[PDB]
Design a protein around this ligand. Structure first.
Ligand code: ZN
Lengths: 287, 68, 136, 32, 178
């Protein structure tokens, strides 16, 4: 009985507790616990995340408070749901993700206690634009050290979700743990009530943004579009057989032809239509 | 996934009698079961140039979000 | 299929030498079973075994499955072939032999109703759990 | 002869309407 | 299949073979889709008679060689001496020295052309074939019935599978059972 290509399920609230606790203590490598359920042999799920108070030692086994462990679990049994811990996490701000020296020491305690106890490393400050730098890892033994680690077998969902990155494979990764796959438990009864309630405005759709700010904009764009038409005349009346596909590449200027064309005309079209349709509907509805 | 191919393979070439089941599996939000209906509409319409099949199968080939 | 046995052995050897320490062993024992399908020609299960005994934990399930692929459509001799490589007389500790063995009987006698349906019926009455009920 | 030609022109016409509908979606999709 | 219908094993065998992402040992199921490219000339319930019939290929022959298992024994063996110098007229006067030594003492060697071209053109597209005869499915229509033999077919023979021969008039013979 040995590993395969596993799968990690995370709940929607679990990821939100990760990025919020990471954004809170952005300099000093925050630490917390991960509470879920072992559903089968080789897929792990997590429903809940609660953090840890800050220890002066740092991210290690000494940052784990056993009296804050059991008494926090004492409350969650009688309210909500009791379940077994399945792992832990921390935050590593200075890089993306790889298990460091004091990372790997406290992992050995957890895999001695649990079956797997999957680690999770998240950089809070790297994740900015629309994506999150989250990855989960899991330590390997020394029994197959001259053999091929990660004993994976009959599947084809292993080549996805990441290739081993060179900022991560220069450290441990390969001959010390392995990487694991993470998707999201995307659910209904949460997805639309997060979408429609976060981005919404009722009366904005039929406002006017006035005329004194709007006729000035219609005044402005036509004036350079006149000179854009004069520059459009210049290339059309030119029309010389100087190998015109080579004549165009020696006359590149990030300019006219068709790019600096009707793009403005489309904006002039859409602005006045939405302005006039809002004007005509408002005369219709109100008295 | 074992029952995905299994309910696709319980019907074979009925060519009109699966259409209530084809509509039922794809309207659900289970991604495996939507995938299971796609193997079901394949095996119920074997070798026939069905215009309704090639319309509907290409329609979910555009607009659906899961890759599988 | 036995009187027109022109397969090639050296192509399978000129792909054998490039086999590194990956899980391509399952990919090779599915390759020879394709190009010896119905041939009933066992030479790779004769000329070498130490390379065949390298991979494990599902390749044994794959290899004894490939034994049934080479013997596709072997009605009576396939019963006594397995009778020799029995689900309980090769090794009682490996469930992958008895799992893929019952899977190999299904590969041989597809679309053939007989005692082999009843023979696999009685061994799904008394079986282990995980990789016995698969190939059964 | 002629009945088979009339059925195949029915089929091919309803075929390339569907592949016309595919390119309508993709050109709409690539704008987004 | 043969007669316009489609196979139920060849469909089911290939569609679970598509599911080799999620499980590698489902790839054994493609063996169901392996249908023979052979004809069978069984006339009686037991006799398969040894019959000879031929081909109608347009300009040649093909199929089933699989011959090539050379390791391509290659040699570096040389780098060409490209000293272009007084060498050029020095080898030329050496070839003048051979025009006194070769053609005046003994050189009478000869060879013959077009022996190897001769065997190619009268070739056989008329290949004769016993009972379980393989044939590529592209040549189910450019085969030829055994009309030159005594034992001539009865079933319309245009696609591979199994047929009856009309084993014609008396003295029936030619068993084969291995
Ligand atoms: Zn760390």
């Amino acid at each position: 009985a040995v590993d395969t290509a596993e799968q990690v399920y995370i709940s929607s609230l679990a990821l939100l507790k990760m990025l919020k606790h990471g954004r809170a203590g952005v300099p000093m490598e925050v630490m917390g616990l991960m509470l879920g359920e072992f559903v089968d042999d080789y897929t792990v799920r997590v429903i809940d995340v609660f953090a840890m108070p800050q220890s002066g030692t740092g991210v290690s086994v000494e940052a784990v408070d056993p009296v804050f462990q059991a008494k926090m679990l004492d409350m969650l049994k009688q309210t909500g749901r009791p379940e077994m811990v399945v792992g832990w996490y921390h935050s590593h701000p200075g890089f993306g993700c790889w298990l460091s020296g004091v990372d790997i020491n406290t992992q050995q305690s957890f895999e001695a206690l649990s079956e797997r106890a999957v680690a999770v490393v998240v950089d809070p400050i790297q994740s900015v634009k629309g994506k999150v730098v989250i990855d989960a890892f899991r330590l390997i033994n020394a029994n197959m050290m001259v053999l091929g680690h990660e004993p994976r077998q009959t599947t084809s969902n292993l080549g996805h979700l990441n290739k081993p990155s060179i900022q991560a494979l220069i450290h441990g990764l390969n001959r010390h743990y392995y990487s694991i796959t993470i998707n999201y438990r995307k659910n209904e009864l949460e997805q639309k009530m997060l979408l429609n309630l976060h981005k919404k405005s009722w009366m904005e759709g039929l406002t006017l943004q006035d005329y004194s700010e709007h006729c000035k904009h219609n005044e402005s764009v036509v004036k350079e579009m006149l000179e854009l038409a004069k520059n459009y005349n210049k290339a059309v009346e030119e029309e010389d057989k100087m190998t015109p596909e080579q004549l165009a590449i020696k006359n590149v200027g990030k300019q006219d032809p068709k790019r600096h064309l009707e793009e403005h005309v489309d904006v002039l079209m859409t602005s006045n239509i939405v302005q006039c349709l809002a004007a005509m509907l408002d005369t219709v509805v109100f008295k | 996934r074992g029952l995905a191919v299994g309910i696709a393979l319980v019907m074979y070439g009925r060519m009109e009698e699966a259409d209530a089941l084809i509509e039922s599996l794809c309207r659900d939000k289970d991604p495996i079961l939507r995938r299971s209906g796609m193997y079901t509409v394949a095996m119920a319409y074997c070798g026939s140039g069905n215009n309704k099949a090639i319309r509907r199968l290409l329609h979910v080939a555009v607009s659906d979000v899961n890759d599988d | 299929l036995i009187r027109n046995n022109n397969t090639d052995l050296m192509i399978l050897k000129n792909t054998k030498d490039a086999v590194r320490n990956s899980v391509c062993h399952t990919a090779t024992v599915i390759a020879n079973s394709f190009m010896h399908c119905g041939t009933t020609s066992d030479q790779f299960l004769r000329d070498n075994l130490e390379w065949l005994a390298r991979a494990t934990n599902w390749a044994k399930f794959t290899a004894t499955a490939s034994l049934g692929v080479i013997h596709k459509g072997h009605e009576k001799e396939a019963l006594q072939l397995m009778a020799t490589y029995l689900p309980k007389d090769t090794s009682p500790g490996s469930a992958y032999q008895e799992g893929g063995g019952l899977y190999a009987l299904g590969l041989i006698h597809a679309n053939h109703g007989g005692d082999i349906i009843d023979y696999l019926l009685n061994q799904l009455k008394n079986a282990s759990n995980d990789i016995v009920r698969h190939g059964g | 002869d002629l009945y088979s030609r009339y059925k195949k022109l029915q089929q091919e016409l309803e075929f390339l309407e569907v592949q016309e509908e595919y390119i309508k979606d993709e050109q709409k999709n690539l704008k987004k | 299949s043969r007669t316009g219908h489609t196979h139920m094993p060849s469909v089911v065998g290939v569609l679970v073979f598509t599911q080799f992402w999620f499980w590698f040992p489902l790839s054994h199921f493609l063996s169901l889709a392996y249908t023979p490219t052979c004809v069978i000339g069984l006339n009686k319930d037991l006799k398969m008679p040894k019959v000879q019939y031929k081909s109608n290929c347009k300009p040649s022959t093909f199929a089933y060689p699989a011959p090539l298992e050379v390791p391509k024994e290659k040699e570096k063996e040389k780098v060409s001496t490209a000293v272009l110098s007084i060498t050029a007229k020095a080898k030329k006067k050496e070839k003048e020295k051979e025009k006194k030594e070769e053609e005046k003492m003994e050189v009478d060697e000869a060879e013959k052309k077009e022996e190897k071209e001769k065997k190619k053109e009268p070739e056989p597209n008329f290949q004769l074939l016993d009972n379980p005869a393989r044939v590529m499915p592209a040549q189910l229509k450019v085969l030829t019935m055994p009309e030159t033999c005594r034992y001539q077919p009865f079933k319309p023979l245009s696609i591979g599978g199994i047929i009856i021969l009309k084993d014609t008039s008396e003295d029936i013979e030619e068993l084969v059972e291995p």
